[PDB]
Write an enzyme that holds these catalytic residues in place. Structure first.
Site, PDB file in Angstrom:
ATOM      1  N   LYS A  90      -6.390   6.780  -4.544  1.00 32.68           N
ATOM      2  CA  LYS A  90      -7.544   6.260  -5.186  1.00 32.68           C
ATOM      3  C   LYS A  90      -8.554   5.809  -4.148  1.00 32.68           C
ATOM      4  O   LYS A  90      -9.739   6.049  -4.288  1.00 32.68           O
ATOM      5  CB  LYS A  90      -7.159   5.226  -6.256  1.00 32.68           C
ATOM      6  CG  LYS A  90      -6.865   5.870  -7.609  1.00 32.68           C
ATOM      7  CD  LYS A  90      -5.703   5.280  -8.417  1.00 32.68           C
ATOM      8  CE  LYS A  90      -4.418   6.125  -8.353  1.00 32.68           C
ATOM      9  NZ  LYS A  90      -3.296   5.549  -9.115  1.00 32.68           N
TER      10      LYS A  90
ATOM     11  N   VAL B  98       0.709  -1.223   0.000  1.00 36.24           N
ATOM     12  CA  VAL B  98       0.000   0.000   0.000  1.00 36.24           C
ATOM     13  C   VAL B  98       0.720   1.241   0.000  1.00 36.24           C
ATOM     14  O   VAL B  98       1.189   1.694   1.033  1.00 36.24           O
ATOM     15  CB  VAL B  98      -1.520   0.018   0.024  1.00 36.24           C
ATOM     16  CG1 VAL B  98      -2.000  -1.098   0.953  1.00 36.24           C
ATOM     17  CG2 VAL B  98      -2.014   1.352   0.535  1.00 36.24           C
TER      18      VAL B  98
ATOM     19  N   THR C 288     -10.873 -10.461 -26.517  1.00 36.30           N
ATOM     20  CA  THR C 288     -10.259 -11.377 -25.631  1.00 36.30           C
ATOM     21  C   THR C 288     -11.215 -12.506 -25.310  1.00 36.30           C
ATOM     22  O   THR C 288     -10.768 -13.622 -24.984  1.00 36.30           O
ATOM     23  CB  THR C 288      -9.914 -10.545 -24.400  1.00 36.30           C
ATOM     24  OG1 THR C 288      -8.648  -9.937 -24.562  1.00 36.30           O
ATOM     25  CG2 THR C 288     -10.093 -11.272 -23.086  1.00 36.30           C
TER      26      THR C 288
END
Ligand code: NA
Ligand code: NA
Length: 327
Positions: free
Chosen positions: A64, A57, A93
């Site tokens: 964010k 972190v 994909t």
DNA sequence: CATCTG
DNA sequence: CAGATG
């Protein structure tokens, strides 16, 4: 598990995007350990700074989390959810055979849709082609009811070719599951083991039969031990034909079948737990074997397994019917 | 990890 | 052969 959810969640969209659209394996990999740790985190993340405190972190992530906590959303995540090019890749994909790598090239060529794809069938390779032909069928779950029919066939034919063949359908089909995604078959023969130098025919012979009778429709990849294909339950008395289904079959030396069978059966959670206990019991287990653990740190020497029973016994555990193999 | 592509 | 897909 639901306290720090949205957080782990956004982190996932973010990581996912890194790797798939950008090339950002680092970054991507970043969001990941991140969501992992907040995941384990026992409290309610109330701020970034608080989070920050955690390993994996950093500052950007913190940032964010704040904005996300601050407001019901995130800009970057919003911007990425619109972006056609981003959406492009996520979609292309979807086709079996098309990965990200390829998804990019296509888009930069301007192939973005299904139609694009057809039109440009020349650019796709075999697998991709099949992958496109079977898009719909491909995504359709497999109900156990067909599962059992399929399994029925496969087994019968395998038997035909050789009485010494030992086939098994692992997966959730094996665990009880009401539907599956694809069909997974573990295969072995007595005449094939650890030392026993090859016998490719062993796999090829069966494949053949499968197409003989038409169960096998196409070949995705056919090596000397692993086969990746397409199959299909005979459309009965014409009105209702079946979907096409992904199917794989892999040869395995008889000497490491059960570990495999076990292993393949899952669930992931059952494995781990079993894996961990094995360890206590002074053992080790992986996809192929069970080895008695020495004390010098580690050590090996393949324990001998004639069933799934043999394994548990070793680790001195309760034989688990596949059904309760859940967690 | 094993297969394919190019 | 690296590099992609599953
Ligand atoms: Na794909
Ligand atoms: Na490199």
């Amino acid at each position: 598990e639901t306290l720090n959810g949205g957080i782990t969640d956004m982190l996932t969209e973010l990581a996912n995007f890194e790797k798939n659209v950008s090339q950002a394996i680092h970054k991507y990999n970043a969001y990941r350990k991140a969501a992992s740790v907040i995941a384990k985190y026992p409290h309610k993340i109330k701020s970034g700074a608080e989070a920050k405190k955690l390993p994996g972190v950093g500052t950007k992530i913190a940032e964010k989390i704040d904005e996300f906590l601050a407001t019901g959303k995130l800009r970057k995540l919003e911007k990425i959810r619109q972006d056609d090019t981003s959406s492009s890749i996520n979609f292309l994909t979807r086709v079996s055979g098309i990965g990200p790598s390829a998804a990019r090239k296509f888009v930069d060529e301007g192939i973005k849709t299904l139609e694009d794809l057809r039109k440009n069938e020349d650019k796709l390779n075999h697998h991709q082609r099949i992958g496109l032909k079977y898009f719909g069928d491909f995504e359709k779950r497999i109900p156990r009811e067909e599962m059992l029919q399929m399994q029925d066939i496969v087994l019968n034919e395998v038997k035909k070719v050789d009485s010494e063949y030992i086939a098994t359908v692992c997966g959730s089909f094996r665990r009880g599951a009401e539907s599956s995604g694809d069909m997974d078959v573990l295969l072995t023969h007595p005449s094939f083991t650890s030392e026993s130098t090859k016998q490719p025919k062993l796999l090829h012979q069966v494949v053949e039969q499968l197409q003989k009778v038409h169960f096998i429709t196409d070949t995705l990849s056919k090596g000397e031990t692993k086969f990746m294909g397409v199959c299909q339950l005979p459309s009965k008395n014409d009105e209702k034909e079946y979907p096409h289904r992904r199917i794989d079959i892999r040869l395995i030396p008889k000497d490491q079948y059960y570990c495999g069978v076990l292993y393949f059966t899952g669930s992931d959670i059952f494995n781990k737990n079993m894996r961990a206990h094995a360890l206590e019991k002074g053992f080790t287990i992986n996809e192929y074997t069970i080895r008695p653990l020495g004390v010098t740190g580690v050590a090996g020497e393949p324990l001998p397994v004639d069933s799934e029973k043999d394994i548990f016994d070793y680790i001195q555990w309760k034989y688990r019917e596949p059904k309760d193999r859940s967690e």
